[PDB]
Design a protein around this nucleic acid. Structure first.
Lengths: 205, 89, 79, 92, 99, 100, 92, 91
DNA sequence: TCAATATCCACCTGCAGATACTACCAAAAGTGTATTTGGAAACTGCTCCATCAAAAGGCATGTTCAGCTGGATTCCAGCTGAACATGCCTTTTGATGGAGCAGTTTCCAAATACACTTTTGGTAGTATCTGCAGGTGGATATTGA
DNA sequence: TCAATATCCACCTGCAGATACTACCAAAAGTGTATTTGGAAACTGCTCCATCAAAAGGCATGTTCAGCTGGAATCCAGCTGAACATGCCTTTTGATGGAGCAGTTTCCAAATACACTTTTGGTAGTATCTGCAGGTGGATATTGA
């Protein structure tokens, strides 16, 4: 594979504690369980990741697979990031939402990378890597979004890279069955705490 | 006059290349060796690199203008920069 | 823009004048840029090795100083 | 009392050019070649461990020193060879 | 019983390299895999030079290597010359070059 | 009762000893090596500072800056030889123009 | 946690030029100067002891290294100063 | 001609070009000015090493310096060429 | 263009120095095994200092001109190379002693460890004070005449 | 040479950003006292190789001449610098992260010591064989014709 995705996957895997590497790998499912059994998880981390990277090289891994891995990693390590809330008002199936969001971003910006993954409670996790009309995207400064289709609420992570927030909000508002969006008075590092109060307000207005 | 500008620029010590262009170039070069990763750069590292580069270029220009005069000229040619690098090693 | 055309004619003229040069040919502005690019490539390659060895994502001044010292160039004012 | 690298140079030569000999003046040059590169690599490896406050020289220090000293494709192949050697040393 | 050069698959000595690293005041401790790596590197470089030199010898229609051949090899190669640019080979001469 | 005082020095003899011990220069270090080396370092330091202060005086100033160090070094035949592969930050160049 | 040579440079300066100060950028240059010469001298002294199969660095190694590194009259005066320092250190 | 035959012949060879006794004599005369006036002995391989190094130095300097005659549009070697080569090298 | 003379190039012969091979050996150096120990990896976490945007004004960009310089040509006298005849200095060879190198003693100097005192680095909060920027007045060289 | 204009120096005032000076502290580190150990100096002896002589001839030295080249003087056209008007990119500032750096734990890999093989360096002695020099012998360009 390209030398730029090998480094991405290696750096991503070196961040994962040995106490839970196997669970993440199993969820990713890119490597078969037989290949996992082939590996030794007791020698130092560098050799383990060398072996896993060789396995990925035998197959053909694309930036989509690595993006899926990064999404899965953040599902477990939510607290690493600060999470902000957005609200949508004045208002499609999941596939239409996916296509509209992706096409909006691809029209505004020539070079991007988008990915989705489903989750319980009708949730969808989104990862966006921002680019420009001249330059490639940055895979190490992404933007993560958690949107619950049966609700007008959307939660966002604080990137060290602005200049794309209004476009993101517009894409969320258009791809879904809404036409406006605002920011709520809630922000913290604990996504579940925001979630609980937000749906408490949603169910009990 | 060239004579006033030479005298003024030899009394001075400040850097002559602007910062942001040099920073952009040095970050563009770095990303090729890091395999796509955008490394961070301390502020005191870019100044070091700039000082070194400007010194290198000034001394090279001196050595080359030594070779323009050897040939009976007043005007600096690339012909003269190439040969100085060969002789220096 | 190509990020090396940001090294302008006046800057090169100033470096030349500080070097004592009276006149300059119009073909000196592209030659100098290549020289500078080569120098920077050589220094930065070694600087990045020193910091990736240490398992960092941040280039410090000591890495640059070590690289230059390897290349045969010793710089004092930094630490 | 005196020691050298001539035995191993002769083996390598018979391994790449089986029909070809080597004179005594030349093997002195080769012995000097081997002693010089050793010193350079070990010197760089000494500093990297000092810069980073380490008391042990490992294969990683040697690898980094190889990358710093050797130019281009030559470093690439040297790294490959050393990595294979360590790999099959450990697996025995 | 068994040596370490054989485990590694080498001709160069892994014990002697270990000894020289320990006796050279390079650091307090020395790992197990450093001598293996270094011996492999040295073997690779020796083989490269000897290959080029044997080729040069054959071109001149000789069966034996002499310093002239090593000099030709080194200066005809764009990388070995850069590694060995501050080095003078005894009884090696110069490359023919007019103009 | 300090070692620098016994020797008549301002530079540190104990620190030099510690740095020689920790630098992997040899398995042992004697007792006169640190004092000898500290004295040499002090001599060179003062030799540079004298010329730098003189250059500052010529420029009508009471505070030394890297320009003065550069002038001192490059106008002295021996210090330039010692420090000829060195570039000094914020030092500039010596004035030099020449007729054709 | 960080250590330097600034105290002693300031003393020497007040000893040669009592009316004269020094800026912070310049003392960095002087600290870099002191660290460089130390490394050179100690490096040469390390080799002389290795060449001659000695396990100890003494004042004789430093003296020889000074002669090798420093040019001309500067080495002469440095040798004089170091010899005096050792002489009056021993006599206490 | 005669210059081209000689150049071709000499670049093809490896042997030393200065005679041995004169070089020995000069080196010993230089050594005696150090040593505080006493005559040191010399191994033979030492003098050969010194001679090889010296001839290499001179040949390489002549090479670097004949590049400055052609730069100036000349064919004849002058001393200013050697001086400038030494200056630019840093010696 | 012709071609003898160098000159080149190839090819064969002989032999002398230097290579490669075999045997002995012995020592010193590397390997295996078991024990203990300490350095470094793995995981947390917190504060610093790096990165990203924005607003504007100062330096760079573009066009024209004319004066200066680079480059080619001609001519002539100085200086280099080539050839030839001498002979002086280098090269090669061999008896000789001075200095390097190994082995044995011992003794002086360095490492190890514990207690105790001193010094240096960093922060808080000052207080100067040196040097730079702007303003104004006096004095000369060079531009063109 | 006259001369106005920059330009050159010099002096002055103002101020603010940076250097010296105190306090203080407390952590790290250096010093002093005993004790043990081993590295290097001092002495003797031996044999290797480096200085010092004397013949032989091959390369260096000196003179002269012919021709090649360096250097100076013309001349012409290309091209670089200077000046002016304009606008775009760099500099400065403020706001957040995210990555470096310090802390704790533990476990795995390194030092240490002892007993046992093995490998490499050196020495006779053997022989053999590669390449250098010589000479034959075929065949090409070359500067004088």
């Amino acid at each position: 594979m390209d030398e730029t995705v090998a480094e991405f996957i290696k750096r991503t895997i070196l961040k994962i504690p040995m106490n839970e590497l196997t669970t993440i790998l199993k969820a990713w499912d890119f490597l078969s369980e037989n290949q996992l059994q082939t590996v030794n998880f007791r020698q130092r981390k560098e050799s383990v990741v060398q072996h896993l990277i060789h396995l990925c090289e035998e197959k053909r891994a694309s930036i989509s697979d690595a993006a899926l891995l990064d999404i899965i990693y953040m599902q477990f390590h939510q607290h690493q990031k600060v999470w902000d809330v957005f609200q949508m008002s004045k208002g499609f199936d999941m596939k239409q939402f996916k296509n509209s969001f992706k096409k909006i971003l691809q029209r505004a910006l020539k070079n991007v990378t988008v990915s989705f993954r489903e989750t319980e409670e009708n949730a969808v996790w989104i990862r966006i890597a921002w680019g420009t009309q001249y330059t490639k995207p940055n895979q190490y400064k992404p933007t993560y979004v958690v949107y619950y289709s049966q609700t007008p609420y959307a939660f966002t992570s604080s990137s060290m890279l602005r200049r794309n927030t209004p476009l993101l909000g517009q894409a969320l508002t258009i791809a879904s069955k809404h036409h406006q969006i605002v920011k709520m008075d809630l922000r913290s590092r604990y996504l579940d705490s925001l979630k609980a109060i937000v749906f408490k307000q949603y169910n009990q207005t | 006059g060239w004579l006033k500008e030479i005298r003024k620029l030899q009394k001075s010590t400040h850097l002559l290349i602007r910062k942001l262009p040099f920073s952009r170039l040095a970050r563009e070069i770095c990303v090729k060796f890091t395999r796509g990763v955008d490394f961070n750069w301390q502020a005191q590292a870019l100044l070091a690199l700039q000082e070194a580069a400007e010194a290198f270029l000034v001394h090279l220009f001196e050595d080359a203008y030594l070779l323009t005069l050897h040939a009976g000229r007043v005007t600096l040619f690339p012909k003269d920069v190439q040969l100085a690098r060969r002789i220096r090693g | 823009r190509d990020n090396i055309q940001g090294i302008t004619k006046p800057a090169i003229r100033r470096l030349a004048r500080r070097g004592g040069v009276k006149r300059i040919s119009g073909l000196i502005y592209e030659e100098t840029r290549g020289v500078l690019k080569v120098f920077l490539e050589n220094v930065i390659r070694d600087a990045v090795t020193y910091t990736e060895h240490a398992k960092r994502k941040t280039v410090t001044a000591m890495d640059v100083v070590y690289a230059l010292k390897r290349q045969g160039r010793t710089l004092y004012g930094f630490g | 009392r005196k020691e050298s690298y001539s035995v191993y140079v002769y083996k390598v030569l018979k391994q790449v050019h089986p029909d070809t000999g080597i004179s005594s003046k030349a093997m002195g040059i080769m012995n000097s070649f081997v002693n010089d590169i050793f010193e350079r690599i070990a010197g760089e490896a000494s500093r990297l461990a000092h810069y980073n406050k380490r008391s042990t020289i490992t294969s990683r220090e040697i690898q980094t020193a190889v990358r710093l000293l050797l130019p281009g494709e030559l470093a690439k192949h040297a790294v490959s060879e050393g990595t294979k050697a360590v790999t099959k040393y450990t697996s025995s | 019983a068994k040596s370490r050069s054989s485990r590694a698959g080498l001709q160069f000595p892994v014990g002697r390299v270990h000894r020289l690293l320990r006796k050279g005041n390079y650091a307090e401790r020395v790992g197990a895999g450093a001598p293996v790596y270094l011996a492999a590197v040295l073997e690779y470089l020796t083989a490269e030079i000897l290959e080029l030199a044997g080729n040069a010898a054959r071109d001149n229609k000789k069966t034996r290597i002499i310093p002239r051949h090593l000099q030709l090899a080194i200066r005809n190669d764009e990388e070995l010359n850069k590694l060995l640019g501050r080095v003078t080979i005894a009884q090696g001469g110069v490359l023919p070059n007019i103009q």
